[PDB]
Amino acid sequence: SKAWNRYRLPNTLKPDSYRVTLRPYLTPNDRGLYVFKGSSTVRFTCKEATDVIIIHSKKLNYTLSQGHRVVLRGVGGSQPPDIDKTELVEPTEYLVVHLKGSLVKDSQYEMDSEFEGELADDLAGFYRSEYMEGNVRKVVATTQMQAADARKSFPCFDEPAMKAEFNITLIHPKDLTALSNMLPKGPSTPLPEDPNWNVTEFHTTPKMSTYLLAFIVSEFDYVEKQASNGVLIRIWARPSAIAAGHGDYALNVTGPILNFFAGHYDTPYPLPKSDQIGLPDFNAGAMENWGLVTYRENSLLFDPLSSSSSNKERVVTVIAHELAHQWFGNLVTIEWWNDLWLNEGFASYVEYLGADYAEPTWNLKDLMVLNDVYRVMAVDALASSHPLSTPASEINTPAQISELFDAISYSKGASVLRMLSSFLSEDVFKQGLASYLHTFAYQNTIYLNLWDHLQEAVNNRSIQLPTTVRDIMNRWTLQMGFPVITVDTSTGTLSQEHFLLDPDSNVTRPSEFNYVWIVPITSIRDGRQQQDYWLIDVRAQNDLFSTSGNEWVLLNLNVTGYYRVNYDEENWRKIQTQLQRDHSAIPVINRAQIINDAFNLASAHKVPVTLALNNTLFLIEERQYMPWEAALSSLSYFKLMFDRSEVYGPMKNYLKKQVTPLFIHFRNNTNNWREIPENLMDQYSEVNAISTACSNGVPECEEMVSGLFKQWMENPNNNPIHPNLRSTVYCNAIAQGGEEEWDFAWEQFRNATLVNEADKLRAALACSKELWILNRYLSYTLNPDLIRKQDATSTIISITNNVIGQGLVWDFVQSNWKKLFNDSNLIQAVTRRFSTEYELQQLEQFKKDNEETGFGSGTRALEQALEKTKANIKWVKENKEVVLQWFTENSK
Amino acid sequence: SKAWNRYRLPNTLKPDSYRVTLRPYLTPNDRGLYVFKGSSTVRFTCKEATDVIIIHSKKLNYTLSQGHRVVLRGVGGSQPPDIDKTELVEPTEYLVVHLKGSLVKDSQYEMDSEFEGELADDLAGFYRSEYMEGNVRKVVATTQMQAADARKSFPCFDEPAMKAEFNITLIHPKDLTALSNMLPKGPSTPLPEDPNWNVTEFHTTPKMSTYLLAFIVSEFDYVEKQASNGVLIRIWARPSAIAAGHGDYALNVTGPILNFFAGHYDTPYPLPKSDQIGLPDFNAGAMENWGLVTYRENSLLFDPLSSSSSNKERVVTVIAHELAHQWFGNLVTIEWWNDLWLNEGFASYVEYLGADYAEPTWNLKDLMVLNDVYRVMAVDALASSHPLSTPASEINTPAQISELFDAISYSKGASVLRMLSSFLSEDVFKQGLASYLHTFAYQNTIYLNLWDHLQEAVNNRSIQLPTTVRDIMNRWTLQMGFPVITVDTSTGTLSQEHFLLDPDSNVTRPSEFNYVWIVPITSIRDGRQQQDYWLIDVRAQNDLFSTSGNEWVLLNLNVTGYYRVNYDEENWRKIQTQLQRDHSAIPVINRAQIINDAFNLASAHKVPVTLALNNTLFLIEERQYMPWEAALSSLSYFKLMFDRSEVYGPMKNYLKKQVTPLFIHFRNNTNNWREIPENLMDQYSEVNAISTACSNGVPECEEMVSGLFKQWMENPNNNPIHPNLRSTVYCNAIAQGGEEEWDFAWEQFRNATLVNEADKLRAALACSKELWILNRYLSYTLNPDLIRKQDATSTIISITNNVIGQGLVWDFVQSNWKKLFNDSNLIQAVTRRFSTEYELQQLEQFKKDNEETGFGSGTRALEQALEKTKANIKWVKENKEVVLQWFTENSK
Ligand SMILES: *[C@@H]1O[C@H](CO)[C@@H](O[C@@H]2O[C@H](CO)[C@@H](O[C@@H]3O[C@H](CO)[C@@H](O)[C@H](O)[C@@H]3O)[C@H](O)[C@H]2NC(C)=O)[C@H](O)[C@H]1NC(C)=O
Ligand SMILES: *[C@@H]1O[C@H](CO)[C@@H](O[C@@H]2O[C@H](CO)[C@@H](O[C@@H]3O[C@H](CO)[C@@H](O)[C@H](O)[C@@H]3O)[C@H](O)[C@H]2NC(C)=O)[C@H](O)[C@H]1NC(C)=O
Ligand SMILES: *[C@@H]1O[C@H](CO)[C@@H](O)[C@H](O)[C@H]1NC(C)=O
Ligand SMILES: *[C@@H]1O[C@H](CO)[C@@H](O)[C@H](O)[C@H]1NC(C)=O
Ligand SMILES: *[C@@H]1O[C@H](CO)[C@@H](O)[C@H](O)[C@H]1NC(C)=O
Ligand SMILES: *[C@@H]1O[C@H](CO)[C@@H](O)[C@H](O)[C@H]1NC(C)=O
Ligand SMILES: *[C@@H]1O[C@H](CO)[C@@H](O)[C@H](O)[C@H]1NC(C)=O
Ligand SMILES: *[C@@H]1O[C@H](CO)[C@@H](O)[C@H](O)[C@H]1NC(C)=O
Ligand SMILES: *[C@@H]1O[C@H](CO)[C@@H](O)[C@H](O)[C@H]1NC(C)=O
Ligand SMILES: *[C@@H]1O[C@H](CO)[C@@H](O)[C@H](O)[C@H]1NC(C)=O
Ligand SMILES: *[C@@H]1O[C@H](CO)[C@@H](O)[C@H](O)[C@H]1NC(C)=O
Ligand SMILES: *[C@@H]1O[C@H](CO)[C@@H](O)[C@H](O)[C@H]1NC(C)=O
Ligand SMILES: *[C@@H]1O[C@H](CO)[C@@H](O)[C@H](O)[C@H]1NC(C)=O
Ligand SMILES: *[C@@H]1O[C@H](CO)[C@@H](O)[C@H](O)[C@H]1NC(C)=O
Ligand SMILES: [Zn+2]
Ligand SMILES: [Zn+2]
Numbered sequence A, B: 001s002k003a004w005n006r007y008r009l010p011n012t013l014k015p016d017s018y019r020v021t022l023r024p025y026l027t028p029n030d031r032g033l034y035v036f037k038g039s040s041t042v043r044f045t046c047k048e049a050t051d052v053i054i055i056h057s058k059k060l061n062y063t064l065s066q067g068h069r070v071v072l073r074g075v076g077g078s079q080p081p082d083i084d085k086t087e088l089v090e091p092t093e094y095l096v097v098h099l100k101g102s103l104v105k106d107s108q109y110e111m112d113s114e115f116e117g118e119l120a121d122d123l124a125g126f127y128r129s130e131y132m133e134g135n136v137r138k139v140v141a142t143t144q145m146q147a148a149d150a151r152k153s154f155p156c157f158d159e160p161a162m163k164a165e166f167n168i169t170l171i172h173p174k175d176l177t178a179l180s181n182m183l184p185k186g187p188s189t190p191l192p193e194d195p196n197w198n199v200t201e202f203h204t205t206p207k208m209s210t211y212l213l214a215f216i217v218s219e220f221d222y223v224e225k226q227a228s229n230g231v232l233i234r235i236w237a238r239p240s241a242i243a244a245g246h247g248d249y250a251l252n253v254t255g256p257i258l259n260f261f262a263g264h265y266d267t268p269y270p271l272p273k274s275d276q277i278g279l280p281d282f283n284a285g286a287m288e289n290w291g292l293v294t295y296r297e298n299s300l301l302f303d304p305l306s307s308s309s310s311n312k313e314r315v316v317t318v319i320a321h322e323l324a325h326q327w328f329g330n331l332v333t334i335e336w337w338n339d340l341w342l343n344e345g346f347a348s349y350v351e352y353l354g355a356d357y358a359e360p361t362w363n364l365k366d367l368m369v370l371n372d373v374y375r376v377m378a379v380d381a382l383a384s385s386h387p388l389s390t391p392a393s394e395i396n397t398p399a400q401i402s403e404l405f406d407a408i409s410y411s412k413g414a415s416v417l418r419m420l421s422s423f424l425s426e427d428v429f430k431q432g433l434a435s436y437l438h439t440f441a442y443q444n445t446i447y448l449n450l451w452d453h454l455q456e457a458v459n460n461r462s463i464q465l466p467t468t469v470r471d472i473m474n475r476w477t478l479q480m481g482f483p484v485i486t487v488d489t490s491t492g493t494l495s496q497e498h499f500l501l502d503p504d505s506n507v508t509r510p511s512e513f514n515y516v517w518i519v520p521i522t523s524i525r526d527g528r529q530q531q532d533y534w535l536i537d538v539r540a541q542n543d544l545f546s547t548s549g550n551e552w553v554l555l556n557l558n559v560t561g562y563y564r565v566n567y568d569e570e571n572w573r574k575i576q577t578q579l580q581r582d583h584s585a586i587p588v589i590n591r592a593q594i595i596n597d598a599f600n601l602a603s604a605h606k607v608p609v610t611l612a613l614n615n616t617l618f619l620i621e622e623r624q625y626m627p628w629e630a631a632l633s634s635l636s637y638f639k640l641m642f643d644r645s646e647v648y649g650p651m652k653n654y655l656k657k658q659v660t661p662l663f664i665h666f667r668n669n670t671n672n673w674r675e676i677p678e679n680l681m682d683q684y685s686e687v688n689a690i691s692t693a694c695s696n697g698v699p700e701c702e703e704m705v706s707g708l709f710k711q712w713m714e715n716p717n718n719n720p721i722h723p724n725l726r727s728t729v730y731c732n733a734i735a736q737g738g739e740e741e742w743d744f745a746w747e748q749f750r751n752a753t754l755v756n757e758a759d760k761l762r763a764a765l766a767c768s769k770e771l772w773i774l775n776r777y778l779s780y781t782l783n784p785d786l787i788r789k790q791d792a793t794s795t796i797i798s799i800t801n802n803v804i805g806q807g808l809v810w811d812f813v814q815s816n817w818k819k820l821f822n823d824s825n826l827i828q829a830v831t832r833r834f835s836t837e838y839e840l841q842q843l844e845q846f847k848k849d850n851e852e853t854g855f856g857s858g859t860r861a862l863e864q865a866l867e868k869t870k871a872n873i874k875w876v877k878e879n880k881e882v883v884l885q886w887f888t889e890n891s892k
Helices: A239-243 A248-264 A309-327 A341-358 A365-380 A398-403 A407-424 A426-440 A447-460 A469-477 A569-585 A588-603 A609-614 A617-621 A625-642 A648-669 A680-695 A699-714 A723-736 A739-750 A755-767 A771-781 A789-801 A805-822 A825-831 A837-850 A856-890 B239-243 B248-264 B309-327 B341-358 B365-380 B398-403 B407-424 B426-440 B447-460 B469-477 B569-585 B588-603 B609-614 B617-621 B625-642 B648-669 B680-695 B699-714 B723-736 B739-750 B755-767 B771-781 B789-801 B805-822 B825-831 B837-850 B856-890
Strands: A013-024 A035-046 A052-056 A070-074 A083-089 A094-099 A107-118 A125-133 A136-144 A165-173 A177-180 A197-201 A215-218 A221-226 A232-237 A273-279 A292-296 A332-334 A443-445 A483-488 A493-498 A519-521 A523-525 A533-535 A539-541 A553-555 A564-567 B013-024 B035-046 B052-056 B070-074 B083-089 B094-099 B107-118 B125-133 B136-144 B165-173 B177-180 B197-201 B215-218 B221-226 B232-237 B273-279 B292-296 B332-334 B443-445 B483-488 B493-498 B519-521 B523-525 B533-535 B539-541 B553-555 B564-567
Touching (some): A013 A125, A165 A177, A165 A215, A232 A248, A273 A309, A309 A341, A309 A723, A332 A341, A332 A426, A407 A426, A407 A469, A407 A519, A443 A447, A483 A553, A553 A588, A588 A609, A625 A680, A680 A723, A755 A771, A771 A789, A771 B648, A789 A805, A789 A825, A805 A837, A825 A856, B013 B052, B070 B094, B248 B273, B248 B309, B248 B341, B273 B309, B309 B680, B332 B341, B398 B856, B407 B426, B407 B519, B483 B519, B553 B564, B588 B609, B588 B625, B617 B648, B625 B856, B648 B856, B680 B699, B680 B723, B699 B739, B723 B755, B755 B771, B755 B789, B771 B789, B771 B805, B825 B856, B837 B856
Parallel strands (some): A013 A165, A273 A292, A332 A443, A483 A564, B013 B165, B232 B273, B273 B292
Antiparallel strands (some): A070 A107, A125 A136, A136 A215, A165 A197, A483 A493, A493 A539, A519 A533, A523 A553, B035 B107, B052 B094, B070 B107, B136 B215, B177 B215, B221 B232
16 A cells, blocks of 8 residues: 555656666676666656655666765755655565655656666666677677666656656767767767767657667667658668668668658658667567667568568568557557557558558558458457457556557557558548647557547548447457357348357456447458448348348458458358359458358357368469468467377378469479569468478478478588578478488578578477477577577477477476576467367466466466367367368368 | 275185086177176185185176075085175175074085176186187187186185185087186087087096186187197187198197106196187286186297297297296195295296207297396386285285286296206206105195205205305395495405495385395306305405406306396406407307496496496497397487487487498398398397387488388288388388378288287387377277277387377376276386476376376386386486487497
C-alpha cells in the first residue's frame, strides 16, 4: 500500500525536460567490467502535493552529493523541502526520495543525479555490441530503451505518456563518432581533464517518450543522401559493410519511403535527419528511435551478390515498418502499453504501403494475409488469447509489458486495420488518420481517440455504416478472438460464433460484447463480386448467400476481413469441383483461404478432416506461391502431431506426390537451376517446391541438393548455389549428409562475413538427423563466443523443430529452467509437438516446479501451451486413423 | 499369522504320489475360451498332526464332489476328519481344506479333486501354442511348470523338495499324439463317452519334483535314434520342420551328449527315453523336463542352408545345457530356489563339456570367459548384487523366485565351478561330483552337500589346500561380488578388496566373511606359467609377483579365477609394450582380460581411463575374435554413456580407424565375401569386423551391406547373403536405407518359415534411424497377431538399444507400466543409458509412481538401475573431457 511498491508511477509529478551526460568506457576496467558514468538533471512539475519523489532507476549506482543520492533544487522561486533519505526499491525499479515536507501543487523543481552502470552485453539500456575487424576487437556503445530500459541508463519518469524534451551530451574517445536522436549542437570540444576524449552535445529533442532515446558511440562509416522532403538520411554500419556497398539498398529506399509517408498522411517528418544504423548485437528486428533508427545487421544491410530475394524483402519491409513508426509511435504515442497495437498494428500494416511504394513490382500487400492474418489466427483461436486492447489495469510489470510485443499487437493489429481500410475505403481511412496525427502530434492516445477521428472522416464523407466506427471497431479491439461465419447456401442464412480450435476450451475472460461481432462481408458468386453486406447479429438471411443449380459463393474476397468462413457440404463440394475444373476461377488469396480455413475448421470439429485434406488435392497443378504456403502452414500442424507416428510415412508420400510435378516444372523452367524466376512470388514458389520435394523424399531433389553442396565443398570460395536456394540446399544437404557436411558448414558459419549467410548456415546446422550432433550443437548455442547471445534462442528453436531435437530440447528446458531464466518463443516452440498425456504431465510438472522462479514474459505462452496440449491429445485420438487412411489412399 | 497367508508350505504334510488326468480342448468353447478339464488324487503322509490341508492351486475352478471342493479319504486304515469348508487364498496360491478334527502323525491319506482351467496363450502351466500350416490353424497343448506353475495345471504340493511319483493320463483327440515324461503304459483306448478322443496313460515317473512334469498334445512328427547307452532319443517338431530335415542336427548330437554325460559322471540316465520337442510359443530358451525336454524352435531346429554358425552353436550348447540338467536338477534337485545355482550354475558350465564332446573342433569352453565370467561381473560389481546362495528365508514369493533366474545363478554359478575345477583339477572335481550324484539321487541338496562330496574326493587324493573346500567355496557362494587383486611388482605385494564399479556405493548386505576371499592365483612371467599361489589374507608378499628389468607378470591365466587384476603403472606399461612388440606373446584369453579388466578398473577409479583406452591401441592388428569382443563389450558402456554427446563422433572415428585393416583383411581373405573362414572363432571375428566397420562409418562396409541387401530385394527368392552375415547386413542395410528397405524386411518377417530367419529380421527392423518408423514398430511388438508374445519384450529391447529408440521406449515404459505389469530385462535395457540428473529423477519418480503396482521380478533390476544411474552421472562428469580428447587425439 506504499506508492513505491506499486508498478505504475504516481500521478503527482510530471517531467518537463532533462539533460543527461553519459560517458561509456569501451575498454574493461581493473575489475574486467565495461562501465558508463553519467549525470542528469530533470525539471518536473508537481501536479499534486507530495512528500516523495518516485522516479525509475534500474542497475544504477549513485555518487553521493551534498549528503544524499540526489540534490533537489527549486525553480522559478519554489523552495523544496530538505531530503530525509533515499532508497532503491528493486522490484518496482524506483529511486525513492523521501522529503522532510511536501512539494507544492503547480510548482516546478529540478533534481540532479550522478551515477554509474554496467555497459553490459545484455542488449538492454545503454549496452555494448562487439565485432572483429581482422584481429582488432571493436566495441560499440549503443542503446535499446523500449519498453522499460531508459531507466537503466539514467533516472527518469519512464512511462510513455511522460513526454519531455531531452538535452543529450556524450563524452567519448576523440576518434569515435557520437550519435543521438538529434544533430550535434555546435562543435565537439576536447574534455578538459583528458583531451583524448571529445564532449559532444546534441540539440534538444522534440517532446517525446523516454523509450525512444538513443545514444551510440562507434567508428562506423556511412553513406548519405538528402531525401526529397529535405531530410538527411544516413545509413551507418561497420566500416567493411559500408565500403562493400551493403548499405546502398537501404539508401535507395529509406528517403523515398519517408517522403511517401509524409505525403500520404499529409504530416511532415519534423526532424532534420533520420539515421539508420545496423548493430552487430541487437535483440529485436529493429527499433524506431526518433532520428536514430537501429537495426540488426540482417535487417538493414544487403549484398546483391549473396543475399536472397527474401532477404531483400525483409530489408525494405523492416525499413518501411520503422519509418511508419515515426508517425505511429513517435509523433503520436500510446498512452500506455496495453494499447501497444496503436504503435505496432499500424507499423505492421503501413509497412506494406511503404514497401509497395519503393518496390511497386513486388505485390507485397498480398502477403499480409499469410504474414499477418493467418499468423495470428492460430493463437487468437485459443481461450487463452487476449484482446487487441487489454484493460490498462492488467498491464503493470515489465514482464507483462514485454508479453504484449506479440502476434496480437502486431499481426492482429495489422489485420483489423486492413479490414477497416477495406470497409471505409483507403481514401476515407487516410483522411481520418491525417486528422488523428494532426490533433495528437507530440501527445498520447488511446484506442477511442483513433475511432473519433475516423468517425470525423466518415461524417464528412457521408459514409453510411450500420453504427458508429467506435461500436463496430470496439468488437474487434476489446474482446479476443474472431468469428467463424457459417453459410447455408440452401436458404441463404449466415451465422457467427466465436471460433475456438478446441470446442471444449474454457473462455474465462468475459466480454461486454458477448463474443458477437459486427462483420463487413464481401463475397463472390461464380467469380463475380456481389454487393457488400453487414452481419450485425448472430444470424441473418439474405439472398446474397443463397444458391441454386451449379452456382457457388465464397465469402471474404481476398481475405480483407478478420474472420473464417464455413459453408454447407454442398457448397464446399461445388468449390472442390471448381478447384478441379479450373482453379484459376477462384482468386489466388481465396484459394489460400479455402485451404487454411478448412484445416482450422477441421481442428474445431466444424468440418470432417477429409474435407480439409480433399481441398489440397488440386495443389498438384497449383503453381502460385500463396495457396501452397497456406497448405504447408496448415500441414505443419499435421507434421507436429504425426512426425513421431505411423501416419508420417503416408503423409510424406502424399506431399511427395503433390509436389513432384511442380518441382519438375521448376527444374525445366530454370534451365536446370541455372536461373531464378523473374516474378517475386514465383521465386518464393520455387523455394517452397524445392523445400517440400526434398523434405518429403523426391529423389531428384535429394540428388540435386547433395550434388550442389558437394560442389561447394570442393570449391569453397566459389559457391554454386543461388542465394534464394541456400537455406533449403544447406538444410537438406546437412540432413542427407553426415559429420563432414556438418563440420564444413560450421566452419563456414564461424568464418562468415555476412549476417545473411551466417543466418542460413546457423539454421541449416539444426537439420542434422544425428542426435549426438544436435546435442553438441545445443551446447554451442549457449556459448556467446560461438553463437551471439542475440541468436541463442533462435538457434535452440531451430533444433527443437527437428523431430530428433524435440526430446533433446524439451529435456534441456525442464532441466535448466532456473539457470536459463535467472541467468516465450522458446516455450511455444518446444511444446507445439505435445499430443500425449505423458507430455501434458511433464508440462504441468514444469509449471509446478518453476512457479516460484516464475515465467515472466513467457507466462501466457505456458497457459496457451497447456490449452493446446489438451486439445492436441483429443485431436490425435479423434483423427489419427482417418488421417492415416486418407494419406494412404490419396498418395498413390 | 495364519499358515495359509505364509508363502512356504507347512512341514506338516508330505506327498507320496499323484495320479492326474488332464483333457485339453483344442477348439474354443461357446465363450471363445480354450480350456482343460482334469482330475487328481494325491496320496500324502501326515508328518505332524494338523487340522488343515494347505496345497497349491492357481487359476483352477473346482467341481463340487460330496458337498465340497475336494474329497478326503483314509489310507491303510486311517480315518480322516470330515471337511468343514475349503477356501482359495489367491496371494499365496493355496487351496485350503479346513477339517473338523486333526489328522494323525505318520498316517497316510488321499485327496481327490476335479477341476478346470484356461488353456491360455500365457506360456505358463498347461498352455496353448499356435502355428499355421498353410491356412489351417494348428493348436498345441503344452506345459511350462518351472518354477511355480505345476499348481496352475493341478493341485499339488508345489515346492521342489516335495518329491513324488506321478501317474499321468492324457485324454486327447484320437488323431493327436499325447506325450509326457514317461512312455505310454499299454495301448491307448477310445474314450467311452466319445470315441473321437483317446485315453493315454503313462508309466509312473521316478520320484521327482513337480516343476519337471510335462504334458503335450500335438500332431508333431519326429526323427529318432537309439543312443549308445540304450536310451531312445526322439526330436519332435511341427511336421514341415521335421520333413525339411531341420531336426537332423539335434538328432546327431543329443544321444551322444547324453551318453557322454552318463559316462563322464559314472551315473546312468535312468529313463527309457529322452524326447526333445520344439514349441512355436515358449518363454525361456528351453526347459529340462525329465524325459520330455522342451525348446523354443530357435534352440532345437537347424537349417544347414539358412541358419548361421552362431545358430548352430546355440543349438548344441542349449541341448548340452538341458541334458546336463538330467543330472544337475532332475536326478539331484535343489532343496529350495535360493540355491538355484546348484541346478543352473552346473548346467551353464557343464554345457560346454557336452558341446565340446559333440563338436571337438570348435573350442567353445574358451567362450565361457566372455559368456559367463564377463557377462556376470557387470552386475556383480554392484552393491545391489546378491550372493550365489541367497539365504533361504529371503526367497518366498513367485516373483522373488523368478528373479533368481539371472546372471548370478547361471553365469557366476558357472564361473565359480570353472575356478573350482581349475584348482582341484578336473579329474578330482568329477570324482567328487560322481559321489554327490550317487548319494543324493532322487533327493534334494543344499550347497553344503556339494562341498562335503568334493571334500571326500580331495581327502581321497591327498590334495592339500589352505583349508577345507567348504571354507574356500563359502567365500565365493555366501557373499556377493568378487575381489580385485592389485599387484605391486616392485615389491611383489598383492592385496584384495571387494570390487565395486562405484567406490561411493553403499554395500548394505553384511558378510560374515567381511568381503575377503580365499583366492587361487595362477600367473605367468614373460609368457611362462609360474607356480600357483593361494591368497588367503587381504595382503601378502611373494617373489612370484616381484619383477625387475624388462620382465612382466600377469595373473589369472586364461581367466580361470572369478576375479579382476590391477597392477602398478610400470607393469601395465610393460604389458602395453608387449602388446605393441608381439601381442601373440600373451595368451588370447589374457589379451581379452587386459582390456576388459582395465575398462572396469577405470570405472572404479583404480586406473586412469586413458590406460584402459591405451590397451585397445593394439587391436588394429588383432585378428582374434575374443580380444575384439571383450573390447566391444567394454566400449558398449562408452556408447551408452556418450552416443547422445559430442564424444560420439571421435569415438566412432577411433573405432573406424581400429577396425579398417581387419575389415580389409576379411574382404581379401573371403575372396570378396564369397567364402567364410574355416575356423569358428575366425567366423565370429569376421562378423564382428563387419558389424564394427559398418556401425562406425567405414565407407566400403556401408557400400557392401547396402549393395547386398539391394540385390536380395531384386531377387527375393535368391538371398545372396551368407547366413553368418545376415543379422549385421540386415541391420545396417535398414539403418542406411529408408521405408522401402524396412517394408521389404517386415514382409519377409511376416512371411518367414524359419525362426532363425525371422529372429534376424525382427532385430534388424529395430535399426531404422527414423523415429516415426521405430514408433510404428513399437506398436507392432504389442500385437500378438504380428509379433509372438514370447518375443514382445525382446523386440522392445532391440528398439531401446537404438539411440533414436531410447526416449521412445523409456517414455512408453513410464506411461504404460500399470497396463504392462498388470496385463526385469526391460528395466535393465531401458535404463542403461541414464547418465543425467534429469533421467535419475524420472527413474526415482517411476519407482514412486508404481510402488503400489509393485515391480515383481524386476524389483532388484530397478534397485540396480538406480545405483548404476548415480554412478553414471559421476562417471560422465569425471571422464567426458579426457575421453573426448583421447578419442580425438588417437583416431587420426
Ligand atoms: C534543455 O534545453 C532547452 C533548450 O535550451 C532548455 O529550454 C530553455 O530553458 C530556459 C530556462 O528555463 C528557458 O528560458 C526561461 O523561460 C522561463 C519560462 O519557463 C522564464 O521564466 C525565464 O526567464 C527563462 O527565459 C528557455 O525558454 C528554454 N528554451 C526553449 C527553446 O524552450 C531546457 O531548460 C533544457 N532542460 C534541461 C533540464 O536542461
Ligand atoms: C501311481 O502308480 C503307482 C504304480 O502303479 C502306484 O504304486 C502302487 O501302489 C499300490 C497301492 O498302494 C502298492 O501296493 C500296496 O502297497 C502297500 C504298502 O504301501 C501294501 O500295504 C498294500 O498291500 C498294496 O500291495 C504298490 O506297491 C505300488 N506299486 C509300486 C510299483 O510302487 C501308486 O499308488 C500310484 N499313485 C496314485 C496316487 O495313483
Ligand atoms: C554497483 O555497485 C555494486 C555494489 O557495490 C557493485 O557490485 C557493482 O559492480 C556496481 N556496478 C558498477 C557498474 O560499478
Ligand atoms: C573531436 O573534437 C575535435 C575538436 O576538438 C573535432 O575536430 C573532431 O571532429 C571531433 N571528432 C569526433 C569523432 O567527434
Ligand atoms: C540503388 O539504385 C541504383 C540507381 O537506381 C541502382 O543502380 C542500384 O542497383 C540500387 N542498389 C541496390 C542495392 O539495389
Ligand atoms: C471535416 O470537415 C471539417 C469542416 O470542413 C474540416 O474542418 C475537418 O478537418 C474535416 N475532418 C476530417 C477528418 O476530414
Ligand atoms: C473427400 O473426397 C473423397 C473422394 O472423392 C470423398 O469420398 C469424400 O466424401 C470427401 N470428403 C468429404 C468430407 O467430403
Ligand atoms: C575465411 O574468410 C576469409 C576472409 O573473408 C577468407 O579469406 C578465407 O578464404 C576463409 N577461410 C577459409 C579457411 O575458408
Ligand atoms: C473359472 O470361474 C471363473 C468365475 O466364475 C470364470 O470367470 C472363469 O472363466 C472360469 N475359468 C474357466 C477356465 O472356465
Ligand atoms: C488312438 O487309439 C487307437 C486305439 O483305440 C490307437 O490305435 C491309436 O494309435 C491311438 N492314436 C493316438 C494318436 O494316440
Ligand atoms: C548329421 O550327421 C550326418 C552323418 O555324419 C551328416 O551327414 C549330416 O551332415 C549331419 N547333419 C547336420 C545337420 O549337421
Ligand atoms: C573315497 O575312498 C573311499 C574308500 O576307498 C571310497 O569308498 C569312496 O567312494 C571315495 N570317495 C570319493 C569321493 O572318491
Ligand atoms: C596413454 O598413452 C599415451 C601416449 O603414449 C601416454 O602419453 C599416456 O601416459 C598413456 N596413459 C596412461 C594412463 O598411461
Ligand atoms: C512367402 O513364402 C512363401 C511360402 O514359403 C513363398 O512361396 C513366397 O514366395 C513368399 N511370398 C512372397 C510375396 O515373397
Ligand atoms: Zn514496430
Ligand atoms: Zn538351465
